[PDB]
Scaffold this active site. Structure first.
Site, short mmCIF file in Angstrom:
data_model
loop_
_atom_site.label_atom_id
_atom_site.label_comp_id
_atom_site.label_asym_id
_atom_site.label_seq_id
_atom_site.Cartn_x
_atom_site.Cartn_y
_atom_site.Cartn_z
N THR B 207 0.82 -1.20 0.00
CA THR B 207 0.00 0.00 0.00
C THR B 207 0.86 1.26 0.00
O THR B 207 0.45 2.30 0.51
CB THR B 207 -0.95 0.04 1.21
OG1 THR B 207 -0.18 0.02 2.42
CG2 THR B 207 -1.88 -1.16 1.20
N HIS B 208 2.06 1.15 -0.57
CA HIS B 208 2.97 2.29 -0.69
C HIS B 208 2.34 3.37 -1.56
O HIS B 208 2.35 4.56 -1.22
CB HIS B 208 4.31 1.83 -1.27
CG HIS B 208 5.42 2.81 -1.07
ND1 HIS B 208 5.23 4.05 -0.51
CD2 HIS B 208 6.75 2.72 -1.35
CE1 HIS B 208 6.39 4.69 -0.46
NE2 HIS B 208 7.32 3.91 -0.96
N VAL B 209 1.79 2.93 -2.69
CA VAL B 209 1.03 3.78 -3.59
C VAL B 209 -0.02 4.57 -2.83
O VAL B 209 -0.10 5.79 -2.94
CB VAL B 209 0.34 2.96 -4.70
CG1 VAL B 209 -0.55 3.85 -5.55
CG2 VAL B 209 1.37 2.24 -5.55
N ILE B 212 1.39 7.27 -0.56
CA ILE B 212 1.91 8.41 -1.31
C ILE B 212 0.79 9.28 -1.90
O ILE B 212 0.86 10.51 -1.84
CB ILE B 212 2.85 7.95 -2.43
CG1 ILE B 212 4.06 7.23 -1.82
CG2 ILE B 212 3.31 9.13 -3.28
CD1 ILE B 212 5.18 6.98 -2.78
#
Lengths: 218, 218
Positions: B207-209, B212
């Protein structure tokens, strides 16, 4: 109030207590190295960062010579990993610079202690920067799985103290990495309060001073 | 146009040329270690940073697997100093992440390559951050006393390229060190142009997206 060994030793700092903690960390590190190779090394990362936590602790309570004593109580084999390369050579200047900036934020001659000559060297600069960085993330991350106050007998003000010390080390990093450019000036937006005047007052008594007084006005 | 060995080898990159340069740096490093102890080590600092320059070069020209080949052509003794501790273990993820961000700025699955699992670990994070840092100051400082273009056959655009790559590595450092906080958001003022949309477009396909896209809107 004591109950365990390590946690009780992690209280008030003096040559005795600090020395004990260092040796006993060096033990975990030691038998790590004696057996479980790379996994052991992965442990040695966090352990080394605990050592750095001790160093920063020694910087914050105004015990710089103790920070210098940290290096002595560490086995050379351990020292090779914790302070790899040129880092072990410029450790004195890193400790000194860090202590200076930290105490300035809280409220010796640089050429004599050999800091300036180290700052003249770009590689020694980078090494110092690596060490100060390590100082920073040693108090940023959970070195111990149990939360232990950076300054003993100051539990409620722990986050305040940590934030402050962190910002101090941040400005030290700014000094090292930018040894009055526009791009250099953009990296001073991190400042909160009181700090600028502390820079003024400290460098007033102490051509680094010149460069900083030039930068501030721009 | 060639004239010397090293300078001629420092031109266009391929397995051959790059391999030669690596081995031949490893020679200076090697006989340094064989004789002049700590002084030799001080040399080994800059030499290692030349190696890192090669790595970044391999990242910028879209030759990531070559960046992975860099580690193979380096003696273990040298590797122990250049990539000390956990750095040698997370080198793959550092190279991968760096390459990704760099190519994104210029215009593989993270769980598969093992980057995400590395980002889950704070110590591996810090190691990755150290490596990316080294990548940055490897092109910031003069590794060679003679200026050699980061990308061969692109001399005039050298400062542009260097600035860009530097900013890319800077955002990578932001990713590592902040794995949508206010304090975290304050560290995004470094951005120039085109970058945000590149983040949007790149993370849209990846869930880095989530973190960000959440950070950007704040």
């Amino acid at each position: 109030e004591p109950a365990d060994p390590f946690i009780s030793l992690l209280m008030d700092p003096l040559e005795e207590s600090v020395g004990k903690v260092v040796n006993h960390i060096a033990q975990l590190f030691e038998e790590a190295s004696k057996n479980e190779g790379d996994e052991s090394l992965v442990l040695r990362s966090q352990l080394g960062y605990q050592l750095f936590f001790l160093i920063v602790r020694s910087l914050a309570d105004g015990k710089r010579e103790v920070s210098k004593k940290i290096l002595s109580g560490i086995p050379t084999s351990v020292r090779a990993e914790v302070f790899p390369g040129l880092q072990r050579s410029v450790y004195k200047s890193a400790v000194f610079l860090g202590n200076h900036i930290i105490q300035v934020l809280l409220g010796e001659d640089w050429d004599v202690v050999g800091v300036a000559k180290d700052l003249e060297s770009a590689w020694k600069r980078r090494a110092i920067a690596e060490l100060i960085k390590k100082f920073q993330v040693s108090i940023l991350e959970q070195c111990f799985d149990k939360p232990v106050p950076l300054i003993p007998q100051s539990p409620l003000n722990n986050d305040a103290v940590i934030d402050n010390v962190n910002k101090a080390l941040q400005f030290a990093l700014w000094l090292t990495e930018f040894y009055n450019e526009t791009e250099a000036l953009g990296e001073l937006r991190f400042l909160d309060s009181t700090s600028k005047n502390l820079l003024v007052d400290s460098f007033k008594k102490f051509t680094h001073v010149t460069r900083i007084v030039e930068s501030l006005e721009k």
